[PDB]
Design a protein around this ligand. Structure first.
Ligand code: MG
Ligand code: MG
Ligand code: MG
Ligand code: MG
Ligand code: MG
Ligand code: MG
Ligand code: MG
Ligand code: MG
Ligand code: MG
Ligand code: MG
Ligand code: MG
Ligand code: MG
Ligand code: MG
Ligand code: MG
Ligand code: MG
Ligand code: MG
Ligand code: MG
Ligand code: MG
Ligand code: MG
Ligand code: MG
Ligand code: MG
Ligand code: ZN
Lengths: 223, 153, 110, 307, 115
RNA sequence: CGAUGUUGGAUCAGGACACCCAAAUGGUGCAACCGCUAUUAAAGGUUCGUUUGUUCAACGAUUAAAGUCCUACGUGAUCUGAG
């Protein structure tokens, strides 16, 4: 069994016409920051505990635990959203990965989900967002290849925050059969765009870019 | 304000544009050389290059096979795509297609026309614009300058 | 809105004889070195392109008559040969179209 | 005599085009390398700083925008201005230019010889430098003049300073009045017929005309604008890049004219800065790769915690 | 963001915020120069057919980074002099409200959970 | 009267000062805070709602203030048609 290579989503530059020098310098700065702060491996759906310097709290630090709804941003501005239900009140905090105020990021349960963005947990039942604030970390071994949690989620009655049944979201983590009807699916399918899957000109190929990124990463680690 | 837009609007929408592009691509794959409007051929050139790349990707690749199945409307050209076009484009990287502007159409619309062609096909060569020979006055002067540069180097 | 007064011929001439409305002369016209006909510098020659397109049309007619169906796309390479010519050692294993016309001067053997 | 149009590649052969390209590239490299030592050939005399002195500026390139953090915890956003190849082209005397200050002409990034006019190419040939894209004029005092041909670097500015940034803003073309002037539109659906975005009344009945200051649809964006008092947080000397606070007018990868702030609150901060310009060959000691401000959270930091 | 005619939820244990009514408590007026209210802004409510003053604790609009984003427009009821009418707040409250402790001392005293 | 198309509202407002706010002062039956008057100044502002077609008007909450007018009771070849 070989070993697989994982690059953080924030290292990938966007599709724009930005000069590569800005990306080079931003990567240098964020690698320097990673030298001090150990940013671990985590995906959308993983459970994280983040310690942030709070000047007004009783202790100088504050801990927040929650499941990662989404990760977005490129380079030094990368952010991830943590969601948790605290005494029946759902709370979402958008942390910035390379903010100096973060003391520690701890993956208490490294897992994947059926979707790359669990934004529907707002409209899902509260039991799918409630997590123990003091759960002990669950260690994982490499040969588990970060197992995907094939969990289907029940939903609150309509309306939702977004139209999750629409094809533009491509969501496989919702039990639509218990919340919508065949007629509603038939209406929702009118917004499908089959040609986008085969446009083959909207695809962003970053093989060489990722190779250069990891070469720079290895050079920094060796230096 | 259309800053940073790479696709031009054609047909009756995005789906109509895709269908026009796939018809043009099927014609190009079948005939190895087609002529059309300059804008449509310019749009089709990139899709032709990417289709040749997908053909080089392999016959047994399911993603490439499905993309070829979608884009080639005539199903007898997929074996041609995977067994003629891709074998003859192996050492190359991106020089698969040649696009040249031809004189406007004869009828009253006077549209700007281009001709697109896969390289190395079984058709008479186009009247390609050839550069001047070294025997010209300016080229000979440049050659003499190059010779003196080499001698001083 | 309707015009308040008739526009005079002086104003009409000043409007529709302005250099913006006049036809501009083209300075990118040259003679084709092959046939001597006129062509633009950035555009292929009309005479030569008509020759190539017509020859391609004849070749395509022959190779379509060689095939009895519309969906009979050859799965091998293709070679066009003219009268008085035989396939070489490299052209074997391909499909061959034979033309009764002699090989044109512009069509290189390759 | 019906002369035809021509370009530089029209008459060249398939073998002379690479030769011409490499010849021009080598000439440009030699010309750029010849000017790397401006202080040892014949520099102009350097005058002491004065309370009413004005410095020359630079012409940088707007690379992009990056987040930055301050030791107090706040987060700002900075713009990257890269000084690619900034040179002094010509000098104009004060009495011959304005009668109050002298004019120094500064040129930005290099461009191709084959797409410039004869006069511009001749001027750059006499000067001894490859042609530049953007050329600007800076009003300086007579004691801050610099010999033409002198290069300029991003170390001309220092971490902790305020600058003025002039550039052509992002042009949005012929825009409607609602986007050009922020006019409120008509209601959407309560019966309005084809008036949802029209300007409405444009003048008064008695005037029987519209005033010259009337706000009407037209061009929007492609005009020169200046941002005043942008703070400099960081200087990357290796890549010659300035980290200027806030936003910068103009699209990314555009030529930007940067100079010292002219606001009255930042009039006399030229004292601590290098007055004539920065000369890397004079100090005989290399500057640090990154020069930071006193409040910038550097990438290598103890992960600041509050006490 | 809480503006005029916005329905809010009273978090502190109060008779007005607990006794059921046929009309939800709506925002009458926001005390900023803008009509929009953020965390820590005093606003006016129509609870049980009467006018009352409240403080915005949390809203559903995203704000700056590392700021909690709640699932409801939470408000805590206040008096004319600025003191809360309730005794205890159970729902979590943003920790940024402790910065301006000079005027929210009694409001933060009854708060139990901070996020 | 071989047509100068109307109230109110929407959009955009130009102007006057007989100044509502903001600014500099005089007198007070001006101790201070609130006020009452008068002088000078028009670059900039002068809110959101319930009822009413409403201009007005009453009421609710605020604001530094929610000014008076002229402009075909500004503006329907820009809009509405509630009267
Ligand atoms: Mg919504
Ligand atoms: Mg069309
Ligand atoms: Mg534009
Ligand atoms: Mg609107
Ligand atoms: Mg109507
Ligand atoms: Mg309409
Ligand atoms: Mg109508
Ligand atoms: Mg008049
Ligand atoms: Mg009542
Ligand atoms: Mg009449
Ligand atoms: Mg009449
Ligand atoms: Mg006005
Ligand atoms: Mg007065
Ligand atoms: Mg006053
Ligand atoms: Mg006024
Ligand atoms: Mg009247
Ligand atoms: Mg009127
Ligand atoms: Mg009118
Ligand atoms: Mg009217
Ligand atoms: Mg009308
Ligand atoms: Mg009626
Ligand atoms: Zn010809």
């Amino acid at each position: 069994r070989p070993e697989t290579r994982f690059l953080s989503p924030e290292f990938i530059p966007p599709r724009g016409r930005t000069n590569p020098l800005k990306f080079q310098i931003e990567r240098k700065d964020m690698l320097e920051r990673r030298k001090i702060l150990h940013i671990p491996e985590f995906y959308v759906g993983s459970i994280l505990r983040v310690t942030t310097a709070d000047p007004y709290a009783s202790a100088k630090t504050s801990q927040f635990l929650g499941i990662c709804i989404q990760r977005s941003g490129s380079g030094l501005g990368a952010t991830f959203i943590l969601r948790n239900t605290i005494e029946g009140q759902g709370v979402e905090i958008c942390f910035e990965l390379y903010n100096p105020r973060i003391q520690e990021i701890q993956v208490v349960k490294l897992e994947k989900r059926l979707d790359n963005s669990l934004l529907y947990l707002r409209d899902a039942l509260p039991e799918y967002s409630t997590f123990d604030v003091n759960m002990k970390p669950i260690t994982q071994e490499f040969n588990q290849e970060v197992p995907v949690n094939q969990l289907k989620v029940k939903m609150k009655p309509k309306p939702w925050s977004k139209r999750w049944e629409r094809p533009k979201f491509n969501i496989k983590g919702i039990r639509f059969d218990l919340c919508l009807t065949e007629e509603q699916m038939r209406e929702a399918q009118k917004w499908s765009q089959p040609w986008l899957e085969f446009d083959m000109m909207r695809e962003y190929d970053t093989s060489k870019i990722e190779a250069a990124i990891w070469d720079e990463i290895e050079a920094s680690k060796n230096s | 304000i259309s800053h940073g837009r790479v696709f031009r609007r054609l047909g009756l929408g995005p789906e109509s544009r895709i269908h026009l592009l796939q018809n043009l691509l099927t014609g190009l794959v079948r005939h190895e050389r087609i002529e059309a409007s300059w804008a449509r051929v310019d749009e089709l050139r990139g899709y032709a290059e990417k289709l040749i790349d997908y053909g080089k990707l392999g016959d047994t690749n399911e993603r490439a096979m499905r993309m070829a199945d979608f884009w080639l409307t005539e199903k007898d050209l997929i074996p041609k795509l995977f067994q003629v076009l891709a074998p003859r484009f192996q050492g190359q990287n991106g020089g698969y297609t040649r696009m040249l502007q031809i004189p406007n159409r004869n009828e009253q619309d006077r549209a700007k026309m281009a001709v697109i062609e896969y390289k190395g096909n079984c058709l008479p060569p186009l009247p390609l614009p050839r550069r001047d020979s070294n025997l010209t006055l300016l080229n000979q002067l440049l050659q003499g300058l190059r010779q003196d540069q080499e001698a001083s180097s | 809105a309707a015009p308040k007064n008739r526009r005079s011929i002086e104003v009409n001439r000043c409007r529709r004889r302005n250099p913006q409305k006049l036809i501009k002369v083209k300075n990118n016209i040259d003679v084709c070195p092959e046939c001597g006909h006129l062509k633009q510098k950035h555009i292929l020659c009309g005479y030569c392109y008509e020759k190539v397109r017509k020859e391609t049309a004849e070749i395509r007619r022959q190779m379509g008559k060689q095939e009895g169906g519309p969906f009979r796309a050859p799965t091998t390479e293709t070679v066009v040969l003219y009268s008085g010519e035989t396939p070489s050692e490299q052209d074997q294993g391909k499909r061959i179209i034979e033309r009764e016309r002699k090989r044109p001067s512009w069509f290189t053997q390759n | 005599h019906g002369k035809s149009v021509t370009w530089w590649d029209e008459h060249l052969s398939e073998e002379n085009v690479p030769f011409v390209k490499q010849l021009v590239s080598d000439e440009n490299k030699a010309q750029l390398a010849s000017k790397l030592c401006p202080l040892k050939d014949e520099p102009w005399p350097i005058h002491p700083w004065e309370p009413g002195s004005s410095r020359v500026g630079l012409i940088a390139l707007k690379l992009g925008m990056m987040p930055l953090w301050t030791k107090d915890g706040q987060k700002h956003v900075v713009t990257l201005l890269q000084v690619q190849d900034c040179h002094v082209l010509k000098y104009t005397p004060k009495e011959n230019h304005n009668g109050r200050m002298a004019a120094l002409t500064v040129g930005g990034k290099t461009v191709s010889h084959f797409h410039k006019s004869a006069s511009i190419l001749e001027f750059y040939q006499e000067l001894g430098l490859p042609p530049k894209q953007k050329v600007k004029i800076f009003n300086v005092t007579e004691n801050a003049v610099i010999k033409p041909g002198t290069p300029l670097y991003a170390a001309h500015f220092r971490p902790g300073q305020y600058v003025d940034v002039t550039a052509k803003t992002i042009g949005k073309g012929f825009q409607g009045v609602m986007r050009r002037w922020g006019f409120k539109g008509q209601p959407a659906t309560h019966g309005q017929t084809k008036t949802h975005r029209r300007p409405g009344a444009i003048s008064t009945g008695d005037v029987a005309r519209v005033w010259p200051g009337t706000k009407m649809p037209g061009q929007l964006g492609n005009i020169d604008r200046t941002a005043f008092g942008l703070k400099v947080w960081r200087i990357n000397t290796k890549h010659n890049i300035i980290y200027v606070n806030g936003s910068v007018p103009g699209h990314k990868n555009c030529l930007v004219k940067i100079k010292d702030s002219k606001l009255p609150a930042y009039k006399d901060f030229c004292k601590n800065l290098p007055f004539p310009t920065y000369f890397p060959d004079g100090d005989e000691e290399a500057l640090p790769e990154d020069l930071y401000d006193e409040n910038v959270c550097q990438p290598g930091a103890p992960s600041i915690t509050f006490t | 963001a809480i503006q005029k005619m916005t329905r809010v939820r009273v978090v502190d244990n109060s008779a007005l915020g607990t006794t059921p009514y046929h009309r939800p408590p709506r925002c009458i007026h926001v005390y900023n120069k803008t009509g929009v209210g953020k965390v820590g802004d005093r606003i006016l409510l129509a609870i049980r057919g009467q006018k009352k003053k409240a403080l915005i604790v949390g809203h559903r609009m995203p704000g700056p980074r590392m700021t909690p984003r709640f699932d409801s427009n939470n408000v805590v009821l206040l008096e004319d002099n600025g003191n809360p009418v309730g005794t205890r707040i159970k729902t979590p409250i943003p920790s940024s409200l402790r910065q301006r402790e000079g005027e929210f001392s009694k409001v933060l005293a009854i708060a139990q959970n901070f996020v």
